[PDB]
């Protein structure tokens, strides 16, 4: 599960 960081970082920002 590597990418949810950019998914939540982009979804949040």
* Spatial distance between the Cα atoms of 5 and 13, rounded to a whole number of angstroms: 11
Solved with: NMR
Sign of the CA dihedral with 7 first, then 5, 10, and 12 last: positive
* Enclosing H/E stretch for 13: none
Breaks (C-N over 2.5 A) in the chain follow: none
CA distances from 1 to 6, 7 (A): 11, 11
Residue 4 contacts by C-beta under 8 Å, 6 or more apart in sequence?
none
């Amino acid at each position: 599960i590597f990418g949810a960081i950019a998914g939540f970082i982009k979804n949040i920002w």
